[PDB]
Structure 1
């Protein structure tokens, strides 16, 4: 009544989602870099940068209006490349300057776990993560973690297939609920001590709920299922998918939270989450779920909005 699914959908369109016109501009930005590398590699077959793949929320259709960087993975092959993290990022930056000679050298900047290509206002910065590639199936290779620089063997193409499958199972709605949950998590990171919640983990948890039959066409109910899953399981239930391997193949782990990469059964996406992190997520999810329930039963629109502002902050006006 006061706030229902349509209210939430309109809020998402108004405040949460990256507008389609901007998403298209940014994807065309990444495609121009992709095409420049493909043309350089066509002329120089020995060049060690073999492929650029858009890998982040823009590629998945889950970007927020707050997006300020475009994610691409660059696949690196050959003996020249150092295995050390610092050396590899310096090596990648040097190769990028050679393939993109029109850029001023200072427009390519190594960071802690990635290399930035800065466009200086004429487009967003592109954040390039290396993948050491040696020809494993499905363009598997060792991706650099943006949490701790660990080398993680995985497949970005298969992750994008994984997300595509859930978006086809629930068109519009899966991506929308992911975006709403990401928007909530951004607010909680500012408000709750020790709160951390990686976007890929939010997507995997929501993909499990969709797989399990949760109806994503009602956004208040889908969010309540997400928050209630976190409170009831306390993030102690292992999340694993059978898209690419059977449950017999999952390696046992001693990690507190286990949300297993759908490509690689020994790669736990949640490996760095501590009990402190978990407790902050659980308290935040309990509070959000409680706010949505109270909002449903609130007698006035003003009270209903106040409760939803506990979930989505002051930008939510009803």
Structure 2
């Protein structure tokens, strides 16, 4: 029952097993900030260098980072006609510019990969994952991002995305960010247990932001989690999600996509475009099972049983 596991029990679990410690998170941000400052200085010495800016784009900049963070996400804006159009060569171009940008790193420490270029530190630091953005001077750093899922160019503004998130964190001081981590932690466990389960982190943040805009209370983690789960099952991800932070709702018009969660920066860009019906069923089944568990824990007669229900949502690391 709720005496055995309450909101506090979920909050303390998030610090111990879900959240990334603040001391580790600030240290991770300092690796990126050093690379950013090196880019500013080199750009000052050479105004014609293509790499005009580097911006942190990931969860660490969002304040939604998980204890299981793979690496630091930063976006570098490429300028000038020299940049090749193909995906393979644009990455190589970026890596070559990056090596020239950082003389102290070895050439082999900068490694192009499928949809990004990675800078790996020598000793005990996380690799920095750099997504190339094609920039032509548009306001608010809008450009052509490289999609990490398929490599297609997406026209959006990462600094505006960050403002969107921070507006919701200002709407719910600490809770909105905490519910995003709890949902992302659940999704990561679900990805390994359920085949055809796919759920994007940015997307989870967009769905939770809509519920926060709708008046859902985030002060209670079990209640807010159940609302996020009850939305997914009730809606079945067939209801389009659109935000009027930067454009009217009318501007989207009609799209044939099965799942429609629209970039609040660009009405043409649909975050859920790669989601299929087989993906959608797997999300709903997990959202159904997750909601059954949290409700079963509310009526559970003993703490031993109440913990076991929560372990269906958060895995073995939850001990209550």
TM-score bracket, shorter-length normalisation: over 0.9
> Deviation of residue 83 (structure 1)?
1.1
| Separation (CA, whole Å) in 1 of partners of 2:282 and 2:122 | 37
> Deviation of residue 183 (structure 1)?
0.2
Give 3-state SS (helix, strand or coil) of 1:213's partner: coil
| Separation (CA, whole Å) in 1 of partners of 2:80 and 2:252 | 31
Give 3-state SS (helix, strand or coil) of 2:199's partner: coil
Give 3-state SS (helix, strand or coil) of 1:66's partner: coil
Deviations 1:133-165 (A, max 9, x none): 001121100000000000000000000000000
> Deviation of residue 41 (structure 1)?
0.2
| Deviation >6 Å, runs of 4+ | none
| 1:251 and 1:266 in contact (8 A); partners too | no
| Separation (CA, whole Å) in 2 of partners of 1:241 and 1:121 | 43
| 1:251 and 1:265 in contact (8 A); partners too | no
Matches within 5 A, 1:239-318: 239-318=241-320
Deviations 1:235-276 (A, max 9, x none): 000000000000111142100000000000010000000000
> Deviation of residue 68 (structure 1)?
2.8
Give 3-state SS (helix, strand or coil) of 1:147's partner: coil
Higher relative contact order (CA 8 A, sep 6+): 2
> Deviation of residue 123 (structure 1)?
1.3
| Separation (CA, whole Å) in 1 of partners of 2:208 and 2:40 | 35
Give 3-state SS (helix, strand or coil) of 1:267's partner: coil
> Deviation of residue 122 (structure 1)?
3.0
Deviations 1:21-66 (A, max 9, x none): 0001011111000000000000000000000000000000001111
Q: CA RMSD in A?
A: 0.6
Residue matched to 1:154? 156
Deviations 1:57-78 (A, max 9, x none): 0000001111130000000000
**If the length of structure 2 is used for normalisation, what is the TM-score?**
0.99
Are 1:61 and 2:63 matched, yes or no?
Answer: yes
Deviations 1:270-301 (A, max 9, x none): 00000000000000000001100000110000
Are 1:140 and 2:173 matched, yes or no?
Answer: no
Which structure 2 segments of 5+ residues have no match? none
Give 3-state SS (helix, strand or coil) of 1:42's partner: helix
Residue matched to 1:3? 5
CA 1:251–1:112: 2 relative to 1, 3 Å: farther
| Separation (CA, whole Å) in 2 of partners of 1:258 and 1:81 | 32
| 1:142 and 1:154 in contact (8 A); partners too | yes
Residue matched to 1:193? 195
Which structure 1 segments of 5+ residues have no match? none
| Separation (CA, whole Å) in 2 of partners of 1:137 and 1:24 | 29
**If the length of structure 1 is used for normalisation, what is the TM-score?**
0.99
> Deviation of residue 121 (structure 1)?
3.3
Give 3-state SS (helix, strand or coil) of 1:188's partner: helix
Deviations 1:154-198 (A, max 9, x none): 000000000000000001100000000000000000000100000
